Design a protein around this nucleic acid. Structure first.
Ligand code: DZ4
Ligand code: MG
Ligand code: MG
Ligand code: MG
Ligand code: MG
Ligand code: MG
Length: 756
DNA sequence: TATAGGCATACGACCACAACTG
DNA sequence: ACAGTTGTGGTCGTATGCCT
């Protein structure tokens, strides 16, 4: 099993290291023969003689073109002759590529910015995380001494907890009488002991929770002051901290630093991403938080360290169990993308697609297009028309079927061969022409991206079959992971076509996919209304809700099935319409906001404040209770009674503050806010003290009683003291609960109620 | 240091104008 | 028979998180 690749330099030459785990033992394979390269397209073949003369300087060492080779490749489905220029060292390329491209004989260069180890995996056809080797996992966390004015890692590390299959322990240097706590003399001895623990256990995966941005940097500052060689890597190296955009990321050579925080942020949608909230969302058990001020007051008085030791231990144990439940999915994703788990777990959608496409391109000898320069990037920032949304027939409908397409945009791409290399290609027998926009796509040869998508969808349907076939939960979970990986990749390709930073960008493919989707959806709607007597209540991008207005459930169902058999005979290629489900009642409030209930009583809710993080739980829960009373029981008096009880408990200050927290994400540097709202005000105040606010931080605040601007009365929920502070009852009544419930009531048809 | 676009929703920022102040 | 602050109704663009 390949765990990772990197490279070192020996006497000026790059040496690839492949970190593998085979039949239970760790191994390092060295490759000294791999050369970096780029491609150049030239106007005159005779001009190469004076492109071998191009030289640069790295920082005092002179950089030359090691050798050249004339090659034939496909670019956008057409044959091209280019020159492959090799260099001695991958750092040569950034220094000389600019003088090459800006040569008069050079039209353009290609593939000059794929990082060396990624390039190695691609060109050798190696794929990490393959095979059936079992990796050893170990989670760890640290607890530090925090004060507000202090510089980073000013204070010592208090405890280091770690957890694995054997159990969870805490190393610390004040005495604590619990069976799982190991006391040592000093902070220095605690760090040395922890390092000994990792070296003894020798895990393949080190799991943290935001270790990328706190734990490893804290450990590094402390080891620099204490004089520790923090030799965590299997080759004896220290963790390697590097800048990734606006944040940092940490490698531990020979192991995999699995930082759960990015993984979970992009895998599940939660109102807040504290470790406590994540753990209770994933496993349903609560976990108590101890705040830094508490930990410090405790440490300085020696008072209640048993409580803080338990907090530290629990941090480690839940980090271990979360890692153990999220790792397999991320390993399947990494096996599909074809890159190391460290890379895939930290990467955005665009780069995952890019890495997959570069590998497939390499297999097919297709030259990769370049990332846009600044001018082209600015040019691609015009938007295009999106999917079709019918304005709903608002209100309460009975006996509803939902019909939708199976993978609409990928099906369109596959059926109509929508690709930059088939767009307006000349000289073909057969074309498909997108509606309303007129883009023509050759049908005589499969395009690059359509063929890849074909393979992906075929194998996802094979998997969905043999998933429920197997009796084995072993293989059922492995197949579910593989199938969900395929889905994420496949449904990112429509978006990638329109991603301004994409290599295989094509605005006309994005526009054509939209046009064909709008056509298929609206034409199917017309067919069910004209030929089958259905009324279409609501429609969004790829499906629609419909009923036969006077008909009972069984005739609605059977007519829908007849329509499905009729429409699918007519749909071309991979296009197919499916029966998603039947709903006894549905409440369509507005575009993107509605709720339906099935015959068994289960309510599903889309778009309503019920699902959003930036609405307080008192409002979300009252809206759900009003929704259940109206859509499940049809009891308006019960709903009015519910609202009256909640507004009364609010105005008597009886509702616990945790049900009043509002969560909103900071989406940018605080400097770049032109309108400063409550969560921005809170975050700016926090930044003016110690707290570092980066994009994606979730601010959780509560609105205090008082007059004047709400931005000045909102405090972080962490600082709320039910003795000191009183919350703003009237804000939570008038601006949170009543709007959310009155929108439901008005959608049912009950406009005026006392609600007081 | 965004895979896409479409939507509902609330509010801050700005503004013009009136009333009121040393 | 005054500049400067304050209050008072408006737009209108900013911001977020959802949906497919
Ligand atoms: N995150 C996203 N980005 C871009 N387009 C998206 C999207 N989500 C949906 N669409 C657009 C593009 C899609 O073509 C369409 C529906 O995609 P699904 O709702 O994921 N349902 P499907 O049938 O594909 O998977 P399953 O087998 O689970 O039902 O909406
Ligand atoms: Mg921690
Ligand atoms: Mg902690
Ligand atoms: Mg579906
Ligand atoms: Mg988006
Ligand atoms: Mg769908």
């Amino acid at each position: 099993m390949i765990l990772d690749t990197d490279y070192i330099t020996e006497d000026g030459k790059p040496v690839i290291r492949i970190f593998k785990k085979e039949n239970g033992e760790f191994k390092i394979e060295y490759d000294r023969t791999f050369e970096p390269y780029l491609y150049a397209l030239l106007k005159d073949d005779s001009a190469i003689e004076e492109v071998k003369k191009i030289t640069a300087e790295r920082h005092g060492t002179v950089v030359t073109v090691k050798r050249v080779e004339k090659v034939q490749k496909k670019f956008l489905g057409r044959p091209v002759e280019v020159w492959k220029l090799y260099f001695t060292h991958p750092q040569d390329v950034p220094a000389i590529m600019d003088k090459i491209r800006e040569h008069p004989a050079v039209i353009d260069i290609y593939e000059y910015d794929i990082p060396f180890a990624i390039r190695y995996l691609i060109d050798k056809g190696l794929v990490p995380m393959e095979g059936d080797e079992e990796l050893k996992l170990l989670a760890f966390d640290i607890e530090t001494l925090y004060h507000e004015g202090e510089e980073f890692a000013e204070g010592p590390i208090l405890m280091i907890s770690y957890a694995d299959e054997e159990g969870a322990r805490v190393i610390t240097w004040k005495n604590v009488d619990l069976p799982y706590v190991d006391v040592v003399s000093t902070e220095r001895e605690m760090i040395k002991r922890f390092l000994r623990v990792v070296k003894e256990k020798d895990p393949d995966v080190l799991i943290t929770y935001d270790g990328d941005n706190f734990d490893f940097a804290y450990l590094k500052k402390r080891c620099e002051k204490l004089g520790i060689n923090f030799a965590l890597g299997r080759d004896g190296s220290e963790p390697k901290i590097q800048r990734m955009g606006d944040r940092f990321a940490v490698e531990v050579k020979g192991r995999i630093h699995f930082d759960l925080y990015p993984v979970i942020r992009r895998t599940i949608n939660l109102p807040t991403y504290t470790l406590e909230a994540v753990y209770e969302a994933v496993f349903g058990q609560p976990k108590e938080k101890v705040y830094a001020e508490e930990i410090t007051t405790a440490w300085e008085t020696g008072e209640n360290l048993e409580r803080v030791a338990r907090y530290s231990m629990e941090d480690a144990k839940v980090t271990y169990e979360l890692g153990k439940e999220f790792l397999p999915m991320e390993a399947q994703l990494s096996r599909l993308i074809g890159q190391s788990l460290w890379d895939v777990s930290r990467s955005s959608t665009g780069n995952l697609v890019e890495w997959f496409l570069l590998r497939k391109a390499y297999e097919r000898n297709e030259l990769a297009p370049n990332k846009p320069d600044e001018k082209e990037l600015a040019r691609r920032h015009q938007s295009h028309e999106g999917g079709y949304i019918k304005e709903p027939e608002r209100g309460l409908w009975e006996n509803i079927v939902y019909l939708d397409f199976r993978s609409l945009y990928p099906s369109i791409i596959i059926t109509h061969n929508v690709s930059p290399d088939t767009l307006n290609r000349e000289g073909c027998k057969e074309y498909d022409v997108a509606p309303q926009v007129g883009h023509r796509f050759c049908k005589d040869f499969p395009g690059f991206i359509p063929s890849l998508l074909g393979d992906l969808l075929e194998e996802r349907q094979k998997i969905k079959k043999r998933m429920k076939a197997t009796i084995d939960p072993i293989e059922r979970k492995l197949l579910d992971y593989r199938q969900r990986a395929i889905k994420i990749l496949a449904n990112s390709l429509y978006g990638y076509y329109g991603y301004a930073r994409a290599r295989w960008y094509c605005k006309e493919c994005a526009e054509s996919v939209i046009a064909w989707g709008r056509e298929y959806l609206t034409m199917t709607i017309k067919e069910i209304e004209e030929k089958y007597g259905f009324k279409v209540i609501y429609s969004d991008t790829d499906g629609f809700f419909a009923t036969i207005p006077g008909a009972d459930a069984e005739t609605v169902k059977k007519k829908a099935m007849e329509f499905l058999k009729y429409i699918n005979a007519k749909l071309p290629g991979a296009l197919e319409l499916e029966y998603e489900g039947f709903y006894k009642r549905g409440l369509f409030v507005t575009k993107k906001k509605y709720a339906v209930i099935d015959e068994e009583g289960k309510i599903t809710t889309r778009g309503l404040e019920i699902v959003r993080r930036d609405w307080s739980e008192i409002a979300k829960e009252t809206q759900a209770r009003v929704l259940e009373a109206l859509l499940k029981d049809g009891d308006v008096e019960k709903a009015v009674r519910i609202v009256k009880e909640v507004t009364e408990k609010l105005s008597k200050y009886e509702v616990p503050p945790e049900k009043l927290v509002i969560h909103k994400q900071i989406t940018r540097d605080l400097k770049d806010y032109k309108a400063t709202g409550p969560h921005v005000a809170v975050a700016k105040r926090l930044a003016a003290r110690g707290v570092k606010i980066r994009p994606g931080t979730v601010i959780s605040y509560i609105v205090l009683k008082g007059s004047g601007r709400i931005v000045d009365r909102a405090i972080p929920f962490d600082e709320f003291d039910p003795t000191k502070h009183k919350y703003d009852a009237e804000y939570y009544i008038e601006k949170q609960v009543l709007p959310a419930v009155e929108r439901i009531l008005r959608a049912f048809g009950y406009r005026k109620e006392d609600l007081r």
